[PDB]
Design an enzyme around this catalytic site. Structure first.
Site, short mmCIF file in Angstrom:
data_model
loop_
_atom_site.label_atom_id
_atom_site.label_comp_id
_atom_site.label_asym_id
_atom_site.label_seq_id
_atom_site.Cartn_x
_atom_site.Cartn_y
_atom_site.Cartn_z
N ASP A 216 0.32 -1.10 -0.02
CA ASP A 216 -0.20 -0.26 0.28
C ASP A 216 0.48 1.01 0.00
OD1 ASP A 216 0.31 -0.36 3.24
OD2 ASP A 216 -0.74 0.87 3.50
N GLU B 74 0.73 -0.41 5.79
CA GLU B 74 1.76 0.35 6.77
C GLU B 74 0.87 1.55 7.28
OE1 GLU B 74 5.06 2.14 8.61
OE2 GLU B 74 3.41 3.17 7.63
ZN LIG Z 1 6.03 3.33 5.44
ZN LIG Z 2 4.88 5.38 4.83
#
Ligand SMILES: [Zn+2]
Ligand SMILES: [Zn+2]
Length: 490
Positions: free
Chosen positions: A82, A149
């Site tokens: 992501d 994340e």
């Molecule tokens: Zn990162």
């Molecule tokens: Zn990041």
């Protein structure tokens, strides 16, 4: 702008920058990884890799050693899929649907009107480059591509052991060339709550608002080691030693902005006999001076204020005023313990960051950090000891694992000495008093030690995310250097 005809896919090292040009072309903000997960897997199939997914959506790709290092050592290259969706406030971009338009401007590559995702667009392409590479003499290899994340890192405790071997991990998620990570702090949110009742302001009690601000504040995690003052605690310290002697009664206590940040402004409004107005004003001026004597070196602009608005009100009952103040005062804050394994690093700490009164409820919010998760408990227990003694309640939540630094672990040592073989010096190896994805990796596989380093990207999570081209070449040079430097396990 000037280099109008320059192709991103022809920057060196090309294979990765090509993979990055491809990653840029398919939209992947947090939670929309499917689109890119597929591409990687279908891709990695075509090359004949054993590619499997897990229940929680993380990609694992197995490549056997090149001839010579079949003796293994097992390694895991890791990045997260992501990106982070942030557009310039004046450009059309449907993140779910539109591609990143990376471009080259000088020593940098940025996207316009949008976050670039160079993180780890510079890390995962890297991973992919190694998989495709025909001439890196590596031992056995796994690639881990985690989902999310930047949305609570769901994928990071997505799954657990028996999905990897190899006691080593290489996270490519740091954002400086020559800056490694061998550990980080876990954390946990705490909340001490008080069930208070109120009695009315007694006759003649003028009501003042003692306030303290201009504290430099900071971030509870990376800035805790400094001398920085905690607004909440300073105003507590004052009422602690002096409230009863001055016979003042408490109406309001508001301080700080969020557990995340060392509180810089805090205030109490109190009721007191108009008799002790010049006393209080003097004691408080005294008190504030003393603060500047104490914190004057690190805390330059320290200002207090003492105005009055005699509004009603309903003062804290005595027994509630008493127990809350003892609590606030007794309660630990700042650093609890410095690490002995590494050369001047904070092992455990906590920040009493937010206090908010209302009618019938005073609530004290704080955030414990630690590298040893054992120490984070130690501290929770102390808060509970206080909470208990005070007749108040604490709840814990938002708990996430830390990453304990092992000094001269195999891989840290290597990296250190392999970088020293590529550069005339040593990297700036570190431990942040903060949360990183590779932390959660220690929950299962504590046996695994690891490292985190990458290219130099500036302003991530903004339309300004610019990445320094020349360090992508570096990043990849040690990413190679070590992959081959890796010792064997028989
Ligand atoms: Zn990162
Ligand atoms: Zn990041």
């Amino acid at each position: 702008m000037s280099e109008f005809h320059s192709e991103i896919s022809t920057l060196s090292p090309a294979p990765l920058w090509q993979f990055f040009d491809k990653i840029c072309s398919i939209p992947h903000p947090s939670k929309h990884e499917e689109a890119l997960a597929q591409y990687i897997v279908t891709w990695a199939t075509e090359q004949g890799f054993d590619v499997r997914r897990d229940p929680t959506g993380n990609v694992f790709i197995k490549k056997p050693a090149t001839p010579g290092m079949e003796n293994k050592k097992g390694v895991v290259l890791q990045a997260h899929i992501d990106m982070v969706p942030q557009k310039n406030e004046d450009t059309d971009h449907d993140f779910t649907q539109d591609p990143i338009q990376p471009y080259i401007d000088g020593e940098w590559v940025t996207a316009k009107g949008t976050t670039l995702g160079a993180d780890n667009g510079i890390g995962m392409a890297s991973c992919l480059a190694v998989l495709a590479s025909k001439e890196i003499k590596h031992g056995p290899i796994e690639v881990l591509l985690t989902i999310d994340e930047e949305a609570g890192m769901t994928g990071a405790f997505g799954l657990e052991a028996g999905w990897l071997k190899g006691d080593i991990l290489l996270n490519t998620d740091s954002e400086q060339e020559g800056e490694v990570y061998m550990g980080c702090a876990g954390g946990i949110d705490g909340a001490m709550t008080f069930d208070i009742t109120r009695d009315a302001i007694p006759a003649g009690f003028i009501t003042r608002q003692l306030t303290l601000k201009g504290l430099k504040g900071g971030h509870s995690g990376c800035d805790i080691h400094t001398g920085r003052g905690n607004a909440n605690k300073l105003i507590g310290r004052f009422l602690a030693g002096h409230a009863q002697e001055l016979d003042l009664r408490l109406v309001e206590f508001r301080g700080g902005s969020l557990r995340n940040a060392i509180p810089r402004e805090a205030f109490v409004t109190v009721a007191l006999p108009a008799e002790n107005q010049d006393k209080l004003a003097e004691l408080f001026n005294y008190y504030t001076e003393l603060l500047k004597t104490e914190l004057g070196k690190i805390e330059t602009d320290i200002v207090t204020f003492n105005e009055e608005v005699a509004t009603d009100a309903q003062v804290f009952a005595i027994a509630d005023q008493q127990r809350f103040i003892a609590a606030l005062n007794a309660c630990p804050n700042g650093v609890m313990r410095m690490s002995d394994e590494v050369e001047g690093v904070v092992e455990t700490s906590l920040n009493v960051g937010v206090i908010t009164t209302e009618e019938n409820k005073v609530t004290v919010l704080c955030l414990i950090r630690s590298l040893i998760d054992s120490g984070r408990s130690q501290v929770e227990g102390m808060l509970q000891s206080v909470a208990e003694l005070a007749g108040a309640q604490i709840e814990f939540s938002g708990a996430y694992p830390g990453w304990k630094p092992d000094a001269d672990s195999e891989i840290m040592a290597i990296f250190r000495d392999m970088y020293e073989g590529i550069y005339g010096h040593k990297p700036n190896i570190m431990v942040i008093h903060a949360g990183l994805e590779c932390g959660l990796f220690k929950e299962p596989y504590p046996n695994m030690d690891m490292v985190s380093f990458g290219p130099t990207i500036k302003f991530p999570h903004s339309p300004d995310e610019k990445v320094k081209i020349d360090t992508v070449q570096l990043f990849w040079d040690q990413m190679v250097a070590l992959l081959e430097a890796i010792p064997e396990k028989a």
